[PDB]
DNA sequence: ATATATATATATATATATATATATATATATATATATATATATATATATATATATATATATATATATATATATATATATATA
DNA sequence: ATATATATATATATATATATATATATATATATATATATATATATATATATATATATATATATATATATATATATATATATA
């Protein structure tokens, strides 16, 4: 009767709950699921360095600086460097040294984990 | 962790949310009484956190949280404007560090969001 | 891998999608409310990508993705034009290396798609 | 039929009571639950020094001074110090020395336990 | 349909008798219950002193003077001494010496029993 | 006089379930702000590979069931010399 | 020997339909594997907070229920001396 993009999205969902392709989509992979493990580790590693940075300089802990430092880690891997340069102007002054601490100064532990996760 | 992820997957939240959605469209589910108590109380925190739109720059979660913490004390059955200013002067100091924002422009956005005078927050600043 | 391929084949998706279509034509399936929330939100991203039609040459996926990322920042309840221009200047640099494109002609396509002035992206370009 | 924020909160509850995600949300974690043990340990340590402070100086025990001293312990950890300065003027005079006793004079016992709990 | 404080009190009671949270609320504690044993001891220790006080001075035994002297024992423990002074004016004259006997003269036996109960 | 269960006056401590005030921490499910990563199902953009089912172009082998041409043999049922 | 129908066996070819195997491509569906991104939904992991629920842990108190302990008395019932 009809085929528009609102109803193509619906009829795709209808076949998913019919044949149960969501839960067999996850349980049949079982190899990509350890990327959740590695992502859980880098989130813990970045956040601990964000708190220790806040106590050595006496600045309050600025929440959401974990996610900013994690985006810049992933773009440094790809090569979007002028993406980085505008965000470094956007964060405040005392936290710019922390963001380059995650990229360059923790290139040993943290960049190897993203090099292991996308592999 | 993966193992805590798996045990919520086997419970089947995708199909169960789909069947509860179809039940709503065939009028088998009404609005729960917890939801009416929620929207009557939360709604002041939604439109007052959208009044922080003209703050630009960095992660603004700290200005967003301490403004929401400041509205919590004024909304008590026994309101405490002394402890409410304690969270308000933290939001002003957090707003000040951002590139582009001033101290007076952050006294504009914070006091306009809470709906109070500017001089109340400036008194506690010192 | 084939072992991840086979487990979706034995679930029988070809027959099940045929019966889902026939149920629709016999009016036993109505439009899900997830789709009404989808098409109301996505539709601004659909026509913005079609506005990059006059860019010619290479794999244009980086120009399309960074424009979609820059549009999404302006659509928040608290919009951030600072981080939006960060994703926008990546689209301008990715566009100007293609054979046939200039810096201003990519400044034409990006600022026309996002619907902003050309000088906002030129300031961040440096 | 409709999708507003009142009935989005409702339909999220209906999928929880259908598939029982609350109780399996607790029993699958079972590592974060020992934070309840450490939090009950700190609150006992704060309450016991509060009553001893009341009898050493002859002041009555002021209830709710546990919660004020426990909030200032966690903000000292993050770094919200002008949060502290307004609160220290708000409590009465003879209890200010107790509030800085939890923060720095019983720093080592109490800040380690918050350093252990958030870890 | 409605959510006022009368039927909020009801629907909390309905969820208790449904899942039996009262009898599992008592039996799962099993450590707080020895406070009943210690409260039984101080009630017996106060009442026996009250009749000995009535027999040494020849005054009739006054019921409820054991309950009054138990409140002054606990308010002395907190530090609410201005509440102590008004009840001392309220009790009759021959029984004022008994009320300071419980707080002071058998402090060592009775204030320790309160000090072990709250712990 | 003494023990128990119930209701009621006065003077109290203690344990639990519920609602309510004030000052808090921790874990869970739901909705919302900001700053993010990862896995899945769906729809869409760009640049692709491989397998299947269907329809269509080009240029062909091979095996079936049907209809038709030309040149025949053999077995059956029917009608005829 | 002819003719109508039903089968087998030789060959060269056409057409309709059902299948296999070679190739280059388009389109509609079903799946897989690479990438950058958006949106809807289902889950995980970091943080700061508000709100609705249930759940522990500190505290001072009121109220409604359920129990314990110390006293003085009344009343209804149940037992003893």
Swiss-Prot record, chains A, D, E:
It comes from the Viruses. It is found in: Virion. Its main location: virion. GO terms for cellular component: virion component. Keywords: Virion. Heterodimer composed of major capsid protein 1 and major capsid protein 2. Self-assembles to form a helical, filamentous nucleocapsid mesuring 400 nm in length and 20 nm in width. Together with capsid protein 2, wraps arounds the DNA and maintains it in an A-form. Capsid proteins probably maintain the DNA in A-form by non-specific desolvation and specific coordination of the DNA phosphate groups by positively charged residues. This certainly protects the viral DNA under conditions such as the extreme desiccation of its host. This is Major capsid protein 1. It comes from Pyrobaculum filamentous virus 1 (PFV1).
UniProtKB/Swiss-Prot annotation, chains B, C:
It comes from the Viruses. It is found in: Virion. One of its GO terms (cellular component) is virion component. Disulfide bonds join 95-106. The keyword Disulfide bond applies. GO terms for molecular function: DNA binding. Its main location: virion. Self-assembles to form a helical, filamentous nucleocapsid. Together with capsid protein 2, wraps arounds the DNA and maintains it in an A-form. Capsid proteins probably maintain the DNA in A-form by non-specific desolvation and specific coordination of the DNA phosphate groups by positively charged residues. This certainly protects the viral DNA under conditions such as the extreme desiccation of its host. This is Major capsid protein 2. The lineage of its organism: Viruses, Adnaviria, Zilligvirae, Taleaviricota, Tokiviricetes.
């Amino acid at each position: 009767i009809a085929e528009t993009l609102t109803e193509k999205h619906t009829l795709g969902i209808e076949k998913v709950v019919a044949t149960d392709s969501w839960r067999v989509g996850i349980t049949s992979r079982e190899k990509k699921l350890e990327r959740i493990n590695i992502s859980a580790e880098i989130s813990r590693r970045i956040q601990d360095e964000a708190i220790a940075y806040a106590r050595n300089k006496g600045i309050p802990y600025l929440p959401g600086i974990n996610g900013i430092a994690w985006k810049l880690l992933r773009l440094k891997w790809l090569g979007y460097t002028d993406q980085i340069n505008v965000v470094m102007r956007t964060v405040p002054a005392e936290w710019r040294d922390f963001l380059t601490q995650i990229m360059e100064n923790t290139q040993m532990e943290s960049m190897y984990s993203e090099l292991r996760k996308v592999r | 962790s993966v193992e805590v992820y798996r045990q919520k997957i086997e419970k089947g939240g995708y199909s169960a949310a789909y069947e509860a959605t179809r039940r709503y469209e065939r009028e088998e589910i009404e609005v729960l009484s917890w939801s009416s108590r929620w929207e009557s109380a939360w709604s002041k925190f939604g439109e007052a956190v959208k009044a922080l739109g003209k703050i630009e720059g960095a992660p603004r979660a700290l200005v967003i949280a301490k403004v929401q913490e400041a509205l919590a004390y004024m909304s008590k059955p026994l309101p405490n404007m002394k402890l409410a200013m304690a969270a308000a002067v933290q939001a002003v100091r957090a707003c000040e560090q951002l590139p582009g924002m001033n101290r007076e422009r952050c006294l504009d956005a914070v006091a306009g969001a809470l709906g109070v005078a500017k001089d109340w927050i400036r008194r506690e600043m010192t």
